Amino acid sequence: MRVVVIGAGVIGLSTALCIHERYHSVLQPLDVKVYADRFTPFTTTDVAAGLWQPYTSEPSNPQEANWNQQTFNYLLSHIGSPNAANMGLTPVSGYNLFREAVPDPYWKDMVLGFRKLTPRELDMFPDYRYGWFNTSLILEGRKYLQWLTERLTERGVKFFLRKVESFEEVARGGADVIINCTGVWAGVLQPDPLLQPGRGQIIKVDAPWLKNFIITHDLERGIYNSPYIIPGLQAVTLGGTFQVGNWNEINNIQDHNTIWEGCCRLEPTLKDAKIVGEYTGFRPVRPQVRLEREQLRFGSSNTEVIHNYGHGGYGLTIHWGCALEVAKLFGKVLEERNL
Amino acid sequence: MRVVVIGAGVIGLSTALCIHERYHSVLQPLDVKVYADRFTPFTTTDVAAGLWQPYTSEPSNPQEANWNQQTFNYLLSHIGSPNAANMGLTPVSGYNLFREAVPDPYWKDMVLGFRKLTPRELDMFPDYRYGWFNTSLILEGRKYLQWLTERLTERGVKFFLRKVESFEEVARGGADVIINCTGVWAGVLQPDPLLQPGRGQIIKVDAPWLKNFIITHDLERGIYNSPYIIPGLQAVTLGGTFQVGNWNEINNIQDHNTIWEGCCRLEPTLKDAKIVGEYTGFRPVRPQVRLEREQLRFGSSNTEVIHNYGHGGYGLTIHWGCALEVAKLFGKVLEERNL
Ligand SMILES: Cc1cc2c(cc1C)[n+](C(=O)C(C)C)c1c(=O)[nH]c(=O)nc-1n2C[C@H](O)[C@H](O)[C@H](O)COP(=O)([O-])OP(=O)(O)OC[C@H]1O[C@@H](n2cnc3c(N)ncnc32)[C@H](O)[C@@H]1O
Ligand SMILES: Cc1cc2c(cc1C)[n+](C(=O)C(C)C)c1c(=O)[nH]c(=O)nc-1n2C[C@H](O)[C@H](O)[C@H](O)COP(=O)([O-])OP(=O)(O)OC[C@H]1O[C@@H](n2cnc3c(N)ncnc32)[C@H](O)[C@@H]1O
Numbered sequence: 001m002r003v004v005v006i007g008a009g010v011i012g013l014s015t016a017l018c019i020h021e022r023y024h025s026v027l028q029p030l031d032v033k034v035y036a037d038r039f040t041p042f043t044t045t046d047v048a049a050g051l052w053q054p055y056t057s058e059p060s061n062p063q064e065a066n067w068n069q070q071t072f073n074y075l076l077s078h079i080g081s082p083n084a085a086n087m088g089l090t091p092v093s094g095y096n097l098f099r100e101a102v103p104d105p106y107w108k109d110m111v112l113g114f115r116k117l118t119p120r121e122l123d124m125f126p127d128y129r130y131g132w133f134n135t136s137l138i139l140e141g142r143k144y145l146q147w148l149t150e151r152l153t154e155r156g157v158k159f160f161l162r163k164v165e166s167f168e169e170v171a172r173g174g175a176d177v178i179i180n181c182t183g184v185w186a187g188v189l190q191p192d193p194l195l196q197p198g199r200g201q202i203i204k205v206d207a208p209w210l211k212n213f214i215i216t217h218d219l220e221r222g223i224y225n226s227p228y229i230i231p232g233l234q235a236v237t238l239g240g241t242f243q244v245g246n247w248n249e250i251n252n253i254q255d256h257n258t259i260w261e262g263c264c265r266l267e268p269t270l271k272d273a274k275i276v277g278e279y280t281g282f283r284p285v286r287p288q289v290r291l292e293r294e295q296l297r298f299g300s301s302n303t304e305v306i307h308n309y310g311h312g313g314y315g316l317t318i319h320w321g322c323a324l325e326v327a328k329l330f331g332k333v334l335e336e337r338n339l
Numbered sequence: 340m341r342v343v344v345i346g347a348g349v350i351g352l353s354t355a356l357c358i359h360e361r362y363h364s365v366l367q368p369l370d371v372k373v374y375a376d377r378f379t380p381f382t383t384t385d386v387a388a389g390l391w392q393p394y395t396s397e398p399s400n401p402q403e404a405n406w407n408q409q410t411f412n413y414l415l416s417h418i419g420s421p422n423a424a425n426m427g428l429t430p431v432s433g434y435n436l437f438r439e440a441v442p443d444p445y446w447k448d449m450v451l452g453f454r455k456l457t458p459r460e461l462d463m464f465p466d467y468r469y470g471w472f473n474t475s476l477i478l479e480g481r482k483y484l485q486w487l488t489e490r491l492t493e494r495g496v497k498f499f500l501r502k503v504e505s506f507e508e509v510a511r512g513g514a515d516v517i518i519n520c521t522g523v524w525a526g527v528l529q530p531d532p533l534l535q536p537g538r539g540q541i542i543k544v545d546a547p548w549l550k551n552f553i554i555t556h557d558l559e560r561g562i563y564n565s566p567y568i569i570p571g572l573q574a575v576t577l578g579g580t581f582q583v584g585n586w587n588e589i590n591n592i593q594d595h596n597t598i599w600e601g602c603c604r605l606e607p608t609l610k611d612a613k614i615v616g617e618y619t620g621f622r623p624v625r626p627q628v629r630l631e632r633e634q635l636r637f638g639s640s641n642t643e644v645i646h647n648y649g650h651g652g653y654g655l656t657i658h659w660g661c662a663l664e665v666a667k668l669f670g671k672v673l674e675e676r677n678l
Contacts, residue, residue, distance in 0.1 A: 079463055082607035085548040090608075091463070092550050093432040093474070112460055113472060121451055124418050124430070133452060133474075135432070138548075209424040209477075209572045211431050211550040233548045268421035 001030055001334075002174050006164050006189075007181035008036035009045035010141065010319045011308055013148035015181055018323035019330050020155055027339060034152070035162035035170075040145040044183055045315065047202065047281035049230045049237050050140040051092070051213060052317045055223060058106045060288045067321020069110050074320045075137055085233060088143025092231055093135035094213030095121075097128035102219075104132070111136045125266065128216065136213075139316050140233050164189065167296055171303035177333060178305045179326065184284040186309045192290070195310055198283030199246040200224060201255040203238040207273035210236050216266060224313060227262030235276060238263045242313065244285055251278040286310025291322050293329050304333050340369055340673075341513055345503050345528075346520035347375035348384035349480065349658045350647055352487035354520055357662035358669050359494055366678060373491070374509070376502040379484040383522055384654065386541065386620035388569045388576050389479040390431070390552060391656045394562060395444050399627040406660020408449050413659045414476055424572060427482025431570055432474035433552030434460075436467040441558075443471070450475045464605060467555065475552075478655050479572050503528065506635055510642040516672060517644050518665065523623040525648045531629070534649055537622030538585040539563060540594040542577040546612035549575050555605060563652060566601030574615060577602045581652065583624055590617040625649025630661050632668050643672050 005016040016034055024030050040046050052075065054068045078084045079091055095117065108114045114134040122128060153159075164170055167189055170178050182189060184197050216226040224242035240259040256278060264270040286309070294305040306326050311318060344355040355373055363369050379385050391414065393407045417423045418430055434456065447453045453473040461467060492498075503509055506528055509517050521528060523536050555565040563581035579598040595617060603609045625648070633644040645665050650657060 076459070076463075080465065080607075082610050085608045086611070090548045090550065112457070113454065115452065115454070118451070120415065124415075126419065135551075138550075208547060209429045211429065211477075211570055212474075231550055268419070269424045271421045272425070 001027060001176045001337075003030070003032045003177045003179065004170050004175040005032065005034045005179045005181060006036065006170070007183060008034055008039045008145075008159065009043040009181065009183055010144060010148070010316055011045075011183065011311065011322070012036065012179070012181035013145065013152060014319045014323040015179060015308055015326050016157055017148060017152055017155070018320075019327045020152070020157055022327045023331065023334070024155070027334060032157045033160060034157060035160045035164055037161070037163035039159070040142050040149075043141070043145065044281045044284065045141045045145060047279045048141045048316055049202065049228070049239055050138050050232050050316065051230050052137045052139060053215075054105070054107050054314050054317050056102075056105050056217075064289065064318065065106055067318045067325070068107060068314070069321070070324065071318045071320040072110050072137070075139060079137070086143075087147045088140035088233065090138050090233065091135055092138045092213055093133070095125075095131055095133055095215065097125055097131040097214065097216040098219075099127070099129050099217075100219065101130045125214070127266070138230070138232055141316065143233065144316075167303070167305060168298055171296065171298050171301070175303060176337075177330065178303065180305060180307045181309060183309055184282045186284070192286075194286045194290075196245050196285045197247050198285035198312055199243040199248070199280065200239065200241050200283060201251050201259065201278065201280040203256060203259055203275055204235040204277040204279070205238055205270070205273040205275045207236050207270065209269070210267065214266065227259065227266050229263050229267055236273070242283065247282070249280055249282075251280050283313045284310050284315070285312045289322065291325055293333070306330060306333075340366060340676075341515040342369070342371045342518065343509055343512070343514040343516070344371065344373045344518040344520060345375065345509070346522060347373055347378045347484075347498070348382040348520065348522055349483060349487070349655055350384075350522065350650065350661070351375065351518070351520035352484065352491060353658045353662040354518060354647055354665050355496060356487060356491055356494070357659075358518070358666045359491070359496060361666045362670065362673070363494070366673060371496045372499065373496060374499045374501045374503055376500065378498070378500060379481050379488075382480070382484065383620045383623065384480045384484060386618045387480045387655055388541065388567070388578055389477050389571050389655065390569050391476045391478060392554075393444070393446050393653050393656050395441070395556070397445055403628065403657065404445055406657045406664070407446060407653070408660070409663065410657045410659040411449050411476070414478060418476070425482075426486045427479035427572065429477050429572065430474055431477045431552055432472070434464070434470055434472055434554065436464055436470040436553065436555040437558075438468055438556075439558065440469045464553070477569070477571055480655065482572065483655075506642070506644065507637055510635065510637050514642065516669065517642065519644055519646045520648060522648055523621045525623070531625075533625045533629075535584050535624045536586050537624035537651055538582040538587070538619065539578065539580050539622060540590050540598065540617065540619040542595060542598055542614055543574040543616040543618070544577055544609065544612040544614045546575050546609060548608065549606065553605060566598065566605045568602050568606055575612070577609070581622065586621070588619055588621075590619050622652045623649050623654070624651045628661065630664055632672070645669060645672075
């Protein structure tokens with residue numbers, strides 16, 4: 001069966017893998033290919049802060065929290081193996097600062113060791129008045145992508161520089177199924193005003209002494225508009241913006257400073273950190289994730305699509321969960337074809 | 340007044356500073372000098388794992404805990420300033436593993452966020468069955484030493500790479516008050532069978548993805564004979580030995596392997612960590628710290644000594660506390676001299 005996964009961000013890959021991993025030898029032939037106009041280091045995924053942490057607010061389609069939970073476990077499960085950092089994974093602990101008290105996140109129990117910070121702790125940051133502490137995981141985009149890639153590759157999945165113009169295209173081509181994991185740019189293949197770019201610029205900097213993440217929150221300014229600092233496998237990511245509907249893909253000096261000054265302020269020692277890079281990306285913002293099946297008639301032949309997009313600022317945090325669901329639907333699709 | 344501090348490890352320096360800091364302009368002249376046959380990077384201090392963490396067992400002296408507490412606060416107080424990492428400080432969180440349950444450490448409340456680990460957590464390190472979690476501080480030897488040094492220097496203390504041979508000699512120089520902070524080698528200036536070398540070899544390795552410390556414990560094997568891993572300002576320190584009465588100062592291949600293999604099991608990712616150095620040092624082991632005053636008659640002239648040594652494996656963890664006490668006695672000494 002000809003399957004075509006469009007997009008090679010964390011979503012496309014995991015998904016592809018997951019499907020193949022689950023059905024390769026459940027169905028004999030099973031042909032998977034991945035088309036994408038961008039591959040790492042060019043995906044949005046490549047620019048994510050790399051932390052597992054869903055938004056504070058309980059998800060609209062409640063199953064999302066499961067996907068999140070499932071993603072976290074899967075990840076955690078790897079922590080212990082030798083390859084975990086080779087997958088781009090590692091545990092990290094850190095803070096979430098606030099200016100006023102606030103309700104515990106629904107994921108309070110998915111993460112390890114969640115607890116409200118004490119005053120002494122808070123004294124470590126004079127701006128904030130309230131916050132939490134917990135340990136979690138770093139799952140780095142680029143590395144994970146490459147891992148995922150090698151995995152798929154050895155599994156025989158094939159990749160292709162392609163810019164799909166239409167699903168039609170792909171279908172006239174031969175795809176029995178098509179899995180749309182085109183991120184923000186999904187709208188192009190089929191409009192979806194729900195979907196929008198959540199622009200975010202960041203700065204990578206070299207400062208090995210920071211071992212914990214620190215994420216501040218301005219309830220007014222909106223989420224991820226406040227300074228944040230996230231240690232990674234080697235560099236640290238300085239961050240602070242999330243602009244909806246903004247599509248400029250260039251790093252802007254203004255933002256650069258607002259990030260630089262804000263973090264520097266939050267974390268004073270940053271004064272000596274050396275900047276090694278700046279990047280900007282589009283969070284595939286959407287009220288909810290679109291992950292559902294859709295049949296498409298072209299001539300006398302039907303073609304199956306399965307959407308998986310709009311993971312906003314938690315694409316990594318919940319990638320796996322969805323990847324599973326798709327496989328699930330994908331399966332139903334096979335049942336209907338009678339295998 | 341002529342003061343002479345012998346030794347330039349973390350102990351000598353802090354102490355010197357502390358004295359000067361407190362009495363420089365309480366007394367006018369005040370002449371401080373520091374003699375030491377070894378200066379960083381050569382002190383024992385230079386090789387410490389760099390973590391704030393007193394031993395598990397309840398203190399011999401009641402005062403040790405306070406010194407520890409005082410040291411921790413002083414340190415913590417700096418976390419927030421821009422220079423903290425320039426002093427060689429940063430917060431780090433981590434684990435303490437055990438094979439059987441065990442009583443909470445007395446310092447449970449001095450550290451930030453102490454708590455017993457949960458099972459999921461424990462699943463992360465399968466050979467153990469029990470343990471704790473808390474956040475604390477890294478205070479790196481070398482860096483701190485240099486910091487301390489620049490500070491003293493600008494304060495006008497003067498340094499001399501010199502091997503003192505006798506208290507007698509120093510006193511004979513014109514030394515009004517000698518401050519003894521000669522670490523394990525203290526015995527030489529005046530015997531003390533209580534004092535012994537707590538040999539420890541370690542391996543520095545480059546592995547930036549490890550962000551938390553992990554210290555295992557073998558109740559039989561003795562303290563710090565078990566593998567431990569401690570992230571630092573740039574490298575990670577692999578460790579695992581504490582041999583009493585051993586004075587070989589060379590790194591030994593068997594230790595190197597027992598450390599390497601033990602940590603590597605504890606933390607399989609090191610499979611890819613690159614070794615960048617190996618070192619060995621003597622913990623100035625002693626049943627309890629010697630920190631007390633002692634007068635010494637030489638000819639028709641008395642000379643005041645204040646001992647400060649035998650901080651075993653917590654010299655950093657408690658340096659400041661003692662430094663204060665000395666200043667205190669030092670003061671009494673001034674009172675007696677009627678200022
Ligand atoms: C930008 C950004 C995102 C962050 C982020 C910080 C930043 C700056 N933070 C944070 O905000 C921290 C502060 C907490 C994280 C984080 O720390 N944790 C977390 O879970 N999430 C975070 N994300 C969100 C995450 O990056 C995003 O959800 C995923 O990358 C989406 O992956 P994808 O595969 O759907 O898109 P993407 O990676 O762009 O994959 C899209 C793919 O489809 C391809 N494509 C599209 N259309 C076509 C076409 N027509 N033909 C061919 N190929 C096509 C494109 O080439 C690419 O292959
Ligand atoms: C070796 C070692 C120690 C560790 C350690 C791991 C290792 C391998 N860990 C751990 O074990 C982790 C696993 C938790 C830490 C840790 O992580 N945290 C912690 O708090 N403690 C730890 N320590 C213990 C600490 O290093 C030690 O207490 C202090 O360095 C003592 O400083 P000092 O100034 O008294 O001696 P040292 O630094 O040797 O200063 C001695 C000074 O006196 C000088 N000197 C002596 N005699 C003379 C003389 N006759 N003439 C001139 N100069 C003289 C010598 O030149 C030097 O200047």
